[PDB]
C-alpha cells in the first residue's frame, strides 16, 4: 500500500505545490509525485 | 532517527505552515512536528 519518496531538496513552496495539485485531484498524484521526484533529482542540493 | 510520521488528514495548505516553520527554523522541526501532528490531530476527527 504505497511506498515513500522523500523530497528533502524541494523548498516549502515546491514541496507544498506537489500535493496542492495532487489533493485537488489524486489521480495525477503519481505524475505529480514523479515531478516531485524529478524535481528532487533536478535540483538535488547536496 | 528516522521516526516516520504520516499526515494523511492534512491538506497542502495545512502542511504549508509546517514546512515554513521547519525550513525557516530547523531548530524546532520536532516542536514543529508536534504542530503538524497537532494539526493532523486537530482536523483528523471528521
Amino acid at each position: 500500500d504505497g511506498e515513500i519518496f522523500y523530497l528533502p531538496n524541494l523548498n516549502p513552496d515546491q514541496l507544498c505545490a506537489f500535493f496542492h495539485s495532487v489533493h485537488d485531484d489524486p489521480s495525477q498524484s503519481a505524475n505529480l509525485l514523479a515531478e516531485a521526484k524529478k524535481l528532487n533529482d533536478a535540483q538535488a542540493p547536496k | 532517527d528516522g521516526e516516520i510520521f504520516y499526515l494523511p488528514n492534512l491538506n497542502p495548505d495545512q502542511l504549508c505552515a509546517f514546512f515554513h516553520s521547519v525550513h525557516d527554523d530547523p531548530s524546532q522541526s520536532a516542536n514543529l512536528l508536534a504542530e503538524a501532528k497537532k494539526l493532523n490531530d486537530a482536523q483528523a476527527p471528521k
Binding site: 528533502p8 495532487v22 489524486p26 503519481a30 | 530547523p26
Partner: peptide
C-alpha cells in the same frame, strides 16, 4: 490512488516525503 504526506524524524529531524498509494 493518491500520495500521502509523510515525514521522517531524523538527524535534521523532519523530512518531507510522500507515500504514494495505488
Amino acid at each position: 490512488e493518491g500520495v500521502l504526506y509523510v515525514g521522517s524524524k531524523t538527524k535534521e529531524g523532519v523530512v518531507h516525503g510522500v507515500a504514494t498509494v495505488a
